[PDB]
Each structure stands twice: as C-alpha cells, then as structure tokens.
Amino acid sequence: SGAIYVGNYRVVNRHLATHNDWANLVWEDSSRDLLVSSTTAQGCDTIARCDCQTGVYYCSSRRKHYPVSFSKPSLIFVEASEYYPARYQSHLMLAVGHSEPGDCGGILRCQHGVVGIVSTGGNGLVGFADVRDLLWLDE
Ligand SMILES: CSc1ccccc1CC(=O)N1C[C@H](C)C[C@H](C(N)=O)C1
Ligand SMILES: [Zn+2]
C-alpha cells in the first residue's frame, strides 16, 4: 500500500484504489496503473521535475529503504493478474532490488522529490510508475 499526497490530490496504484478514490476520481490510466483522486486536505509531498536515474525507495516487505539505479520511463510488458490482462504498462521504470505485490504504493524519491510509486516487480527487479510528467499535480 502507499499514496502520494500533493495539493488537493491523492495518487495511488489504480489496482489498489478504494470506492472513495473512484467517487472523487480526477484521472486514471490502466496502462500506467495510476489513479488520482481529490482530497479535502492539502498535501505536502514535492513532485520531482527531473530526469534522475538514481534514488531511494521504500520496501514495506523489508521495512527498509533501498538506494536504486532505475531505467528511463518506458513501455514494458507485464504478465496477467487479478487486476489486469497481459499487457504493456507505459511510463514504467525498472530497477534491481527487492519487491513483493504488497510493496505497491511504496514511494521512490530522488534529491528533487517524489519520482513515482512501486507498481510491478520481478526476479530481483522492481518497477515504479513514473509521476514526474504529470505537471498538473503542482497546479
Ligand atoms: C511490486 S509488484 C510484484 C513484485 C514481485 C513479484 C510480483 C509482483 C506482482 C506484479 O508485478 N504484478 C501484480 C501487481 C499487483 C500489478 C502489477 C501491474 N502493475 O500490472 C503486476
Ligand atoms: Zn531528480
């Protein structure tokens, strides 16, 4: 689990969004596994606006933060699940590191702020759904 709170927004993994997130739906993209919803309160996370390929992510299954090098946002094939059929997920960044399904929502940060959230994982890999292009989150 895990969310990004920026201004009057809440960014979560689309596969994990609640009835509330869908009742206050601002934007959603199944190809990105992202969903943004309105909040009454003000969020204080800073979204990074950069092209950093290194950072730090939170890994809930280990109760630890890990430093990672990660790939550029791209279309990567992701196998079927209870949430999605077999497909390419866009805006996805891969890194060598530990992850488990329950790790989704874990924030990835660089020195410039919030980069994205854990969304996929593999054999000694971890995927992060990028949020740095969603310029409208700040305004
Ligand atoms: C951190 S996810 C993970 C990690 C290790 C092993 C397996 C997984 C599970 C995984 O990659 N998928 C199921 C997930 C609930 C939705 C993902 C997607 N965005 O389409 C695909
Ligand atoms: Zn950065």
Side-chain angles (χ1 to χ4, degrees), residues 62-113:
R62 287 294 188 274
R63 289 198 204 122
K64 257 197 186 66
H65 299 253
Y66 287 109
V68 286
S69 281
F70 53 90
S71 76
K72 311 229 72 215
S74 58
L75 262 189
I76 288 139
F77 179 82
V78 176
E79 292 174 270
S81 82
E82 334 89 271
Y83 312 115
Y84 301 110
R87 84 219 204 278
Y88 290 97
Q89 177 168 321
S90 60
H91 299 271
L92 184 64
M93 299 167 298
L94 298 183
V96 177
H98 178 77
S99 60
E100 296 180 37
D103 285 316
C104 284
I107 282 152
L108 173 71
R109 302 181 70 98
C110 64
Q111 68 180 107
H112 308 111

Side-chain angles (χ1 to χ4, degrees), residues 48 50-52 110-112 115 132:
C50 69
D51 81 340
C52 275
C110 64
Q111 68 180 107
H112 308 111
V115 173
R132 306 175 286 183

